[PDB]
Write a protein that binds this ligand. Structure first.
Ligand code: CLA
Ligand code: CLA
Ligand code: CLA
Ligand code: CLA
Ligand code: CLA
Ligand code: CLA
Ligand code: CLA
Ligand SMILES: CCCCCCCCCCCCCCCCCC(=O)OC[C@H](CO[C@@H]1O[C@H](CO)[C@H](O)[C@H](O)[C@H]1O)OC(=O)CCCCCCCCCCCCCCCCC
Ligand SMILES: CC(=O)O[C@H]1CC(C)(C)C(=C=C/C(C)=C/C=C/C(C)=C/C=C/C=C(C)/C=C/C=C(\C)C(=O)C[C@@]23O[C@]2(C)C[C@@H](O)CC3(C)C)[C@](C)(O)C1
Ligand SMILES: CC1=C(C#C/C(C)=C/C=C/C(C)=C/C=C/C=C(C)/C=C/C=C(C)/C=C/[C@@]23O[C@]2(C)C[C@@H](O)CC3(C)C)C(C)(C)C[C@H](O)C1
Ligand code: OEX
Ligand SMILES: [Fe+2]
Lengths: 333, 214, 50, 124, 34, 50
């Protein structure tokens, strides 16, 4: 029995409190350093110039911020897309002045979530189950990559990525609306439909299952105590739930193969989020949503406003104000 | 014929006649008489085998070409032309381009090595003319198991089989390589060191200067 | 930074030291796997033979 | 390196190297004796060290001293391509700057976390 | 800061080689059924 | 190979950086240095490197 073997075995063991696996060798150190740097920076990071115009923005708790206003400000616009690790700066203070911690945290977080997907698959393989949970987890990973990496790549600067904070997230969303018209993009519509449908189906499935629960408890005891871990029979009556659902809407319209029902539950939000991440990715290369500006014209030629023109008005209001000092020329290219 | 995998070889090419008997013989001139072509010291006696005579031919060529390879690298790399001549830099170390080295060197040393290989082939014929039966590449005493010179060959018959394989293969591959190097240098007017070392480098046109950074 | 660079080695020390980690791994891996030439399983992703 | 050596290098060989800020050296000490009416076509001003006036106590007494400070902006500080007419009023050379890249935004950080931005300029 | 780069370059190649040689060590055989 | 042959001896290809403006020219002397060629393959994918 060699040493390598022994190791490989401990690593791929399924009796450890938390599964390590080979993807864990990438997930654990990377996520740990990302979270350590994030926690330190959220508390004591000095201000950073983000637009590269020597106007630093404070985002740390010790610099007069609260939980909502605080954020990890993305790297400077002067750097752009350039790689900026610690050792390329002449001093740590300068590294902090140009927003290096944002790059560090975001790159490590992306590697960590990819390794997290891999580790999910690896444990699925070890336990002898069907290996497609990480496919479902791919959708949030794709969304995070689009918002943190793909959009800066398309725009050409890391300063365009989503800042790690609440108010920073809202600022990113508003500027995205102004410069890109996300709402009128069919992929954002698909994503909103997917999220609303996911909530709808979650609530309805939970209500239907809990409503039809076999009576195996008193009244002075939590209904949840009727079920025992490791049961052999279904604690709920599918027949009653399907009868209620069919009578509610229609007989034909109803799922019976609970397997098909759960597959649909998995399918709806996942495809919605995939389509949304594709909206963000496509719009990172300036393929914006529909522009129905001045589409309606009367006989003479005068323009009649629609509801889209008021959206354009709000977009103009946001646009002429964002990054007030950064621009020097009429067009935002 | 596995060498020429989807093809047939000579109606009588052998598999054990020579170690290199994978069957590669497309035109397979082995079939042809391969005798004392234009009276090549005809014997009509043992006369080896016509295939075995072609085998001795390949052996001589590959051995000479193998030595030729090292004589195309060591003049440049290994020993950097240790010509160390008492005088006369030309015809000595200086010409590291092998073609130009031949262009310079006086006929003194040319006749030296000419008479050297001349005595070599004289002894080879002296053996082979009598060494019938198995001509065995006119082996005679040259490093044979009897080892007519120092460290008289001390190996095993299975090791001898592997050694025959080693020699034959290296000779064939070197017969390729000598062609390589020669056409290389002639069609570049240089020595192998020249093209290979600028290759493994970075061109002077682009070097990103140096790290003159603060 | 933007200086192209083969891999990203700028100082011979950096390459000569990113070396021993990979070679250490190669050695520990060779410790289990050594003197292996044959044992063709000829099956769909079996590799049962150690 | 001198200007005659940088002119040999192409733009691709220089990008990133960081020598765009560096000022060319001059060799071979000699006298020019400018003809009146001549002018300086190029002029590069490179700061090698920065300091800010501050109050600090040595042995119980505080006095105005210039404390050192590291620059926060990466490689912006250097000025170049300054032009101006040289004249001689009473046999004295007068540069009189006239035009060229002469301002440069620069931020420097004092000990204690204090950030001091300033405009490094040579105007008028 | 060259030392910091050296240490990080080690850690990275350390863990990456761990990954590469862990997945090369007959992983498909590691499985519930045999 | 066919693409290389087209660019070198079959009428050439369009080159923007050609002197006098973009036009079709023959690439007579391609760069064969392995270091410069694989510098692209082994360089960083970040800004300034590409
Ligand atoms: C699984 C472990 C792991 C991995 C993958 C990374 C990965 C990374 N770290 Mg890192 N780090 C780790 C653990 C890890 N870290 C730990 C434990 C610490 C604490 C000491 C740190 C501390 C740290 C700092 C302080 C910094 C990084 C930085 C980086 C980035 C650049 C590093 C680099 O150039 O490597 C070079 C390595 C190689 C070239 C060898 C890899 C070669 C193979 C073939 C992989 C090829 C990959 C290819 C793209 C596909 C990179 C994303 C830098 C950063 O984020 O800059 C913004 C930075 O400044 N790390
Ligand atoms: C009712 C109105 C409404 C609704 C429902 C939505 C709905 C949505 N919008 Mg939105 N939007 C609206 C109005 C609305 N919008 C308006 C008015 C505007 C204009 C201001 C926008 C502008 C806008 C933009 C600009 C963007 C959205 C996006 C989205 C999507 C969110 C993606 C998401 O969270 O999943 C994605 C999930 C994640 C990113 C999470 C990843 C989690 C990682 C993998 C792990 C994290 C672990 C964590 C750190 C620690 C774990 C916890 C541990 C400690 C226990 C979603 C479809 C985003 C989008 O397109 O999706 C990418 C987006 O970028 N919207
Ligand atoms: C009377 C209430 C009502 C109705 C009928 C709708 C109906 C609709 N909304 Mg809507 N919406 C409403 C109230 C309503 N909304 C309110 C109060 C808000 C917040 C102000 C929104 C915010 C909202 C957004 C942000 C989006 C919609 C979208 C949609 C369309 C797809 C939604 C979907 O499939 O969800 C899933 C339901 C069943 C599967 C659909 C036409 C989406 C769309 O595609 O518009 C065309 C879209 O992007 N709505
Ligand atoms: C002077 C050059 C020369 C000569 C006379 C021969 C002569 C012969 N070769 Mg040979 N050969 C040569 C160069 C030569 N070879 C080179 C350079 C290679 C490398 C590609 C080979 C590879 C080669 C193979 C692989 C085989 C031969 C075979 C043969 C025999 C038919 C005959 C003895 C065949 C043989 O000996 O079978 C009896 C055979 O199978 N040769
Ligand atoms: C001394 C003069 C001499 C003589 C009599 C022979 C005689 C012969 N040579 Mg030979 N040879 C010589 C010099 C000589 N060689 C030199 C100087 C070189 C170099 C070669 C290279 C050589 C090769 C490569 C081959 C022969 C072969 C042969 C045989 C046909 C025959 C026995 C063939 C056997 C064969 O293929 N010779
Ligand atoms: C086929 C074999 C062969 C031939 C014909 C020559 C022929 C020659 N060699 Mg040479 N040489 C050879 C093999 C050979 N060498 C080998 C194997 C080595 C390595 C030890 C050398 C090392 C060598 C040196 C070091 C020098 C020569 C030199 C010379 C030239 C006198 C002459 C052209 C000399 C020359 O002109 O250059 C010289 O200085 N040779
Ligand atoms: C791969 C190297 C190698 C090996 C293993 C052998 C092996 C052997 N040689 Mg050989 N030989 C070689 C290269 C080699 N030779 C070269 C390069 C030459 C030319 C100088 C010769 C010239 C040669 C002769 C002349 C004779 C051998 C003989 C033998 C015997 C034994 C099988 C004998 C049989 C014999 O007499 N060899
Ligand atoms: C032979 C073929 C077999 C090759 C096997 C290797 C396959 C890799 C081929 C793709 C080339 C990689 C692109 C170069 C990236 C690089 O090293 O430089 C890209 C940067 C270079 O790093 C920066 O380079 C700059 C350039 O001047 C400066 O030098 C900086 O100092 C230096 O940090 O390195 C990294 O930051 C990336 C490595 C991070 C490690 C990620 C691990 C990913 C998980 C590995 C999974 C196993 C696969
Ligand atoms: C007592 C006595 O005397 O008995 C003797 C018997 C004997 C047998 C003589 C003895 C021995 C053994 C000996 C002499 C063995 C010698 C073996 C020898 C000398 C074998 C050379 C091979 C070269 C080859 C195959 C070609 C290589 C090179 C090739 C194919 C290339 O690719 C070259 C290439 O260059 C080009 C074409 C272009 C370049 O861009 C790229 C490169 C560089 C890659 C002893 C022990 O001394 C005793
Ligand atoms: C020492 C030295 C010098 C030298 C030298 C010398 C003399 C070098 C000489 C090298 C030499 C003499 C190199 C021969 C190669 C023969 C080959 C490759 C034959 C191939 C033949 C092949 C590949 C054919 C294979 C066949 O399958 C085909 C194609 C058809 C089939 O039916 C039949 C066969 C099986 C046959 C200088 C230059 C004088 C000075 C310098 O300083 C150093
Ligand atoms: O950084 Mn963020 O927001 Ca994309 O557009 Mn241009 O840059 Mn700025 O302006 Mn608009
Ligand atoms: Fe369920």
């Amino acid at each position: 029995v060699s040493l390598w073997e022994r190791f490989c075995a401990w690593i791929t063991s399924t009796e450890n409190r938390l599964y390590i696996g080979w993807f864990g060798c990438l997930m654990f150190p990377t996520l740990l350093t990302a979270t350590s740097c994030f926690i330190i920076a959220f508390i004591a990071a000095p201000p950073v110039d983000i637009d590269g115009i020597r106007e630093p923005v404070s985002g740390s708790l010790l610099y007069g911020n609260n939980i909502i206003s605080g954020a990890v400000v993305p790297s400077s616009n002067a750097i752009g897309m350039h790689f900026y690790p610690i050792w390329e700066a002449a001093s740590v203070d300068e590294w902090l002045y140009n927003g290096g911690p944002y790059q560090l945290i975001v790159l490590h977080f992306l590697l960590g979530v990819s390794a997290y997907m891999g580790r999910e698959w690896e444990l699925s393989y070890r336990l002898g189950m069907r290996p497609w949970i990480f496919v479902a987890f791919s959708a949030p990973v794709a969304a995070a990559s689009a918002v943190f990496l793909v959009y800066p790549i398309g725009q050409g600067s890391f300063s365009d990525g989503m800042p790690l904070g609440i108010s920073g997230t809202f600022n990113f969303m508003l500027v995205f609306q102004a410069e890109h018209n996300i709402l009128m993009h069919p992929f954002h519509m698909a994503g909103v439909a997917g999220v609303f449908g996911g909530s709808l189906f979650s609530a309805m499935h939970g209500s239907l299952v809990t409503s039809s629960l076999i009576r195996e408890t008193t009244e002075n005891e939590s209904t949840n105590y009727g079920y025992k871990f490791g049961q052999e029979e279904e604690t709920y009556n599918i027949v009653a739930a399907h009868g209620y659902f069919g009578r509610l809407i229609f007989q034909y319209a109803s799922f019976n193969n609970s397997r098909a029902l759960h597959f649909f539950l998995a399918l709806w939000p996942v495809v919605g989020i995939w389509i949304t991440a594709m909206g963000i990715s496509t719009m990172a290369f300036n393929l914006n949503g529909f522009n129905f500006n001045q589409s309606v014209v009367d006989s003479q030629g005068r323009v009649i406003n629609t509801w889209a023109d008021i959206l354009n008005r709000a977009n103009l209001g946001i646009e002429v104000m964002h990054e007030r000092n950064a621009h020097n020329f009429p067009l935002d290219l | 014929s596995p060498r020429a995998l989807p093809f047939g070889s000579a109606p009588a090419t052998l598999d054990g006649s020579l170690v290199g008997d994978v069957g590669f013989d497309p035109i397979g001139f082995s079939t042809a008489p391969f005798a004392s072509f234009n009276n090549p010291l005809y014997k009509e006696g043992d006369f080896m085998s016509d295939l075995e005579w072609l085998r001795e031919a390949e052996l001589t060529h590959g051995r000479i070409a193998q030595l030729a390879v090292l004589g195309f690298i060591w003049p440049a790399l290994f020993g950097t032309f240790p010509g160390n001549e008492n005088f006369g830099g030309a015809d000595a170390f200086s010409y590291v381009n092998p073609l130009e080295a031949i262009t310079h060197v006086p006929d003194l040393a040319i006749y030296q090595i000419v008479g050297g290989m001349a005595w070599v082939e004289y002894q080879r014929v002296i053996r082979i003319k009598e060494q019938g039966k198995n001509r065995v590449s006119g082996d005679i005493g040259l490093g044979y198991p009897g080892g007519w010179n120092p460290f008289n060959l001390n190996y095993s018959p299975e090791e001898y089989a592997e050694k025959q394989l080693q020699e034959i293969k290296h000779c064939r591959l070197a017969m390729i390589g000598a062609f390589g190097l020669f056409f290389q240098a002639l069609n570049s007017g240089t020595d192998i060191v020249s093209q290979l070392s600028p290759a493994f480098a970075a061109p002077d046109y682009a070097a990103k200067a140096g790290y003159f950074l603060p | 930074a933007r200086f192209a660079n083969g891999k990203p080695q700028s100082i011979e020390a950096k390459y000569i030291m990113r070396s021993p980690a990979e070679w250490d791994r190669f050695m520990r891996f060779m410790d289990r796997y050594a003197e292996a030439n044959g044992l063709g399983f000829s099956s769909x992703x079996x590799x049962x033979x150690x | 390196l001198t200007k005659s050596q940088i002119n040999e290098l192409s733009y691709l060989q220089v990008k990133g190297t960081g020598l765009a800020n560096r000022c060319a050296e001059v060799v071979g000490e000699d006298s020019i004796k400018p003809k009146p009416g001549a002018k300086l076509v190029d002029m590069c001003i490179e700061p090698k060290a920065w300091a800010v006036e501050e109050e600090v106590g040595k042995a119980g007494k505080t006095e105005k001293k210039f404390v050192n400070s590291k620059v926060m902006t990466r490689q912006t500080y250097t000025l170049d391509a300054i032009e101006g007419p040289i004249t001689v009023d009473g046999g004295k050379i007068t540069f009189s700057e006239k035009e060229g890249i002469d301002y440069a935004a620069t931020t420097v950080q004092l000990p204690g976390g204090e950030r001091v931005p300033f405009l490094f300029t040579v105007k008028d | 800061m060259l030392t910091l780069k050296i240490l990080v370059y080690t850690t990275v190649i350390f863990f990456v080689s761990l990954f590469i040689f862990g997945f090369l060590s007959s992983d498909p055989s590691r499985n519930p059924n045999r | 190979f066919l693409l290389v042959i087209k660019a070198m001896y079959l009428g050439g290809v369009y080159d923007t950086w050609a002197p006098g403006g973009g036009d079709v020219r023959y690439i007579t002397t391609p760069t064969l240095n392995p270091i410069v060629i694989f510098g692209y393959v082994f360089r960083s994918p970040f800004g300034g490197d590409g």
